[model samples]
Target: QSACTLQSETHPPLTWQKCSSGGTCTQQTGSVVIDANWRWTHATNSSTNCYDGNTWSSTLCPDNETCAKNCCLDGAAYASTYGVTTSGNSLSIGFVTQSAQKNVGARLYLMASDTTYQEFTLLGNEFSFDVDVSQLPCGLNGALYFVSMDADGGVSKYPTNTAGAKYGTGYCDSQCPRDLKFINGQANVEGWEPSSNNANTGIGGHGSCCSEMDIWQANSISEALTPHPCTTVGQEICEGDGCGGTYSDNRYGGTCDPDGCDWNPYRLGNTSFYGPGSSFTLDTTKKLTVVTQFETSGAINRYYVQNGVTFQQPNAELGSYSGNELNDDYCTAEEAEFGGSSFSDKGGLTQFKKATSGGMVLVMSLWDDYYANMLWLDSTYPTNETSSTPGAVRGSCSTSSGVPAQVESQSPNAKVTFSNIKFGPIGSTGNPSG
Candidate 1:
């Protein structure tokens, strides 16, 4: 028989607990102090700011999802059958685990939400997902990996306006965001089976339904982690080159992954279609329109088929088409934990291009706040083999030095936040290898 378990409860000045007899803990604690103005944006300067027991380690990430260093957020686990919480001091205790369920879900409530997850940079960029993995139910094969998340309601119902219905209505859609689970060292978008309790809304009665927005297998995520596009010769792929169909110059022919995957590209001058700088409320119409546009375009080409369509590379006119993994292929432990959905939809191709474009609109147009933190933003060329910069296959250059340069060019204006955030084991202080 299966059992349901509650995860962690909050405590002040958080303390750690070993929730299971078989589990041991690896803890990182810290305090972070910063200017009131240093809001975490989706761009380079975004802050990770969680307490690590001794100092605050900011989550500096690229909006484009290209981490030259290729490192991402920390992971921990908590079990549900045996879970508890205690509070005192200046700590925020959560759970972690060496072995965890691949599909135990996660939810978060704002301490006091005001439609911004109870917290915000007011810049529209927000961090979601804080699961206690230690308590998750052990999966059949192993713990299931989590992947893909989105507002549960229809796209129109963002910051969900419902009250006490799973999530509160006070902040940007109250729906619990998706938890892209990492299970048994594999990656996939996790969705509960109908027999399982509390299935996602709009699941399925039809033979078809959308699972998570993005999900891939473990190898895809591993490929992405390396900071280079995964289109090596003989690798299984359906990328922009317009190759491979049932016949042709099939570089990635038969050996390619049976499961599909692809990159989402961005238009050069379409910030309206894309997200605007640091923080700005995403106009629902704009988001809808953009998704609609992509889907329709893809559909017309039969690339975004309505049903279980075989994946294929559409001709370029639609601006670089890539394959998408199917929903049925996504739910299991293996799929969610290993693969990656390309994040090309996020940032510019390079700093120079970004600087040239955003600078003209933001700086040249007198929008001081637009490029407020970007005057010195620049990018380092792609290079995966650098000792000082290990995970940084590529990166943008930045500094707090306060001098001015192209967002993609080397310059003194780059801030400490921007300089080192692009890639590698290096941080603003030095190498992360202690």
Candidate 2:
């Protein structure tokens, strides 16, 4: 028992923001009925009221752009919407009565720029998700949250920072890098859209349309102070020689900019390095001594070529590594100046130097080639824990609280503590825009 229906406006264009601007004079009339029981408790017990027909809501249901097009039209894929779903920019649409009682409340409306069609009404029955515009009204730039991604299948992590500020309820000590949108080869970051799925600009699935772009490597550093410009092109491999050409003036001229490298990421330096102090910006007082292998450690992780090479004698154990790919014992640059050992133990501020230890396994020198060409090692530093195929380090616990866990010998490369990471380039094909 609730109604305010009026979405049909054949005479209402003076202000719904000009109703699509002269397309038809903007029309709106009908459906504002929100009733499931009544007022708030986080929609307690749930009476469900999700209607995108226009206003009338509950909360959290098929919003990340309509539940990511119903999870990519139901195929089970994940790589960027990380945990799945959640939203709270500001919502409330009270109304109840089919009897009105027991766990009732539902509302979500963004019909102006069409935030993906969010509308719900449980026991009362009504639904819509694949929504967008997590919160936009008042000039608008990026609203707030608008995710429901699927990079390939897992690793979405957008902890909060369109404006809600880094969050403070459950987790997110420091996370804010995934808003990707490379396209074509793939990188979209969260279900992309350039013309559909409610295109607000385009990137996620629309980048690939529905999938593809989960493998990248970074650390090019200095782009005249993070100049960002490589949103999507083709035929990669910018220039020759890797590791950012040691800044001979900052190379990589293949000309890509996928929305300026998804918001500046030449390791966060452009005008002359802006991150990781002293030199190659990675941040946090500059702590990069990453030496994994307490069972298998690439430290902050991401070196997989299948993890097979080996150089030996840093502690010896190339015969067994299941930390999941990338293991020439690790120590490039003449085997990291002979069995590498740079120290910074977790706390990661960027010092990590292994380049590929031992000898002759050749796939392209780990750090030297920056995981050969593009990366995918994904997560493993301090607490970026990841799993979906790639062995070892599951049990035999030398230690495993959140996953800084490793102890194959003494300090395979030892280091842990909320290891931060997110390198995309292998498929998102903005062509090596690490």
Candidate 3:
């Protein structure tokens, strides 16, 4: 006879627990230990079931028939733009169109199901990859960022209001914003300037639209370590840009407080920038690596590499001048743990915590600067205006004609190759070293 044992109580918790010999043996006395003979053959049934932690599902993914988000493969794993191709572990995104008006670009995402979004915790995790964009057109812009829907109800939604405009309903809609953004040519984590006439919500005498709006917020004091000028117009002024500018007002410095520092949540233009002063270039001939880490235990989140270039560091102390890590003052591990969704409030120092814990998806894209007029291309191509400085904001390229039409194929060639996309715990390393 099978040695089955029943530990009964007043009622069943309705939740099943795996048999274990360690820790508290029982929570509810009703827990039972079935005999080994009762276990079925091929218990896991890998052929038909998907195992997620302790639960087994008939389907492969939460809402889809096949696994999507964590696969990180070429085919079916992502929703990409035109001319996207994958071979083995690498992917090449090609640009066939040139116009921002047509939204001609490459985009990729890790979706949960065909229609559902997957949220992954960044705490105790890291996202790493190797990428090359040396062939990207000289004047265009490429972006790596995170986008999500405001959980009002039903399907997920994103903001649609133009740059610097508030989400009317405080949700992501047509003019949705990205939580984190890395500009390719410029190679900086800077704010957005209006590109089209519609975005010009002139509030602060700043000529550009929605100048009052800020998308990327500094959720912690570590995020505020790097400082820059809060601009109303012209161009954003930063320290390393050789702009020789400063915030004459002390109020603009430090963490963005609701009472005073609210004007510019994060004054740091580009926390840690790696690239040439002008015309940010990626050597297609070389291997490039990028890594992002979320240190839940340390209450910090940071990047290890950008476009294959590692950040500058004098030492490896927990918090250094390395612009990679986002450190917080209020959201430390001692104050709060690493589990929460949405920002209780909006500010540079608090926004990171809110959106991070909420489900986040990985996104890669290529776009034109027609809307912002920022340029890193050499002065040879006069599509709009010109700048004497290498990395400074080029003049306005906007016109009454609205956004530019898509260009034909490669005026100079535009393509990016990505390899070794990975998400793991901290201390995890990737290819191409560093």
Candidate 4:
């Protein structure tokens, strides 16, 4: 692919903190870049789009290698086009932008430098961030997560890739989405079929797969923390049905486990703990401090701070599960109850430890689900199960509430800001006040 020419790639300045065990936090210089999928992939010498509205131009993209040679991923007009902005230490992303360009959603990755992504080793450490999700609605998600993407965006692995991390080239998650325009540095145009509803999305022949740790996936009224491990250490390419999660016919058939052992308050039977009004323990209308601890005890723990008070994650009230944190036993229970082997088959806790131990790329995004309209997160899923069943009910919303069109049109101004990111030894950053 060619280098972006119409608009120069510019990294947005974003600052984060690196702290010590004593609670001393030092501000670090960092930046963020928009994902390549969100950028324009056009003919190298012409402005003609090689990928138009979820379908590839047959002439320019007849095959993967030819498409890779003919197309180029361009730069973004951050604020004007995608509604992405960074101020001081904060990053804010808009759900639907209708000004310079009509955009639906966005995804970003933290950059250590122009050419390399910042990586993290999560075990025995803590990650803290300040989030304001008041404007986010039921179907929308404002997420801060991690994936095991290569530090250089697969430049060493894929010779066809000229654009590296500097251009936001590589992005993969546990979901193994087929929407990625390029996989393994080649155009993902084979067997592409555009979905009927979404004009700008489709399924490709290949998917980029990776281990994903969803430190936070939420809207105002609901939240979840999940870890999805994989057999592969870092980024790997998979073919068609071989790629599992959301894209495949069977979500659990892929290498990475899509059915994560999620610790969601509403799903775990603590619905009253999180929601809109002050009637809840953690009001959705207010901004809160979220902390995730990757404990050496093999448990991932979480707590929150709002109005200067600290609150532990409520224990699971579901009869099928008993704990809120992510551990082997907790994950095993999910497997037993759900009668699925996705998690364990994909390496589960043992893989989670190794996945986090090596490194992870920091990701933040604001998106609406195209597959299930996010019912898996905020509303009862399957719609076939009775509410009386354990895990059948996730959030209070109706199973049909999260249609993409309704959420996008109704809450166009919806936004999520992630700020004051801090990382350090256990109990360091964002430690409870004495």
lDDT against the true structure, each candidate:
0.18, 0.18, 0.29, 0.86
Ranking by TM-score: 4, 3, 1, 2
Query: Which predicted model would earn the best lDDT?
Result: 4
lDDT of 3 by residue, 249-316 (tens): 23222222212111111122232232322322322344555555556532444443555465522122
Over the stretch 3-90, how does candidate 1's per-residue lDDT look in tens digits? Answer: 0112212211221111111232222221111110111111113333221221222332121122212222221122221121223212
Error of 2 at 418 (Å): 17
Model 4: per-residue Cα lDDT over 149-174, one tens digit each: 99988888888998888888888988
Error of 1 at 123 (Å): 10
Q: Give me the candidate number with maximum TM-score.
A: 4
Q: What is the lDDT of residue 66 in candidate 3?
A: 26
Query: Which regions of candidate 3 deviate over 4 angstroms?
Result: 1-81, 97-103, 150-285, 297-324, 328-345, 376-412, 429-434
Between candidates 2 and 3, the one scoring higher on lDDT is 3
Candidate 2 lDDT, tens digit per residue, 1-434? 11111211111011111111112222222111111111111111333333222122323332433322221111110111111112221122211112322111121112222111221111111111111111211111111111112211121322211101000001100011111222112222233223222212222222111100111212222111011112121112121112122111222322221111111122111222222345523332322311112111322222111122322211222223223222233222212322212111111111111111111000000011111111111112112333322221122112221111111122222111111111121212111111
- Model 1 Cα shift for residue 195 (angstroms): 7.0
Give, for candidate 3, the lowest lDDT window spanning 10 residues: 202-211
Of candidates 4 and 1, the better by TM-score: 4
Which regions of candidate 1 fall more than 4 Å away from where they truly are? 1-105, 109-160, 164-342, 345-434
Root mean square deviation (Cα) for candidate 4: 1.9
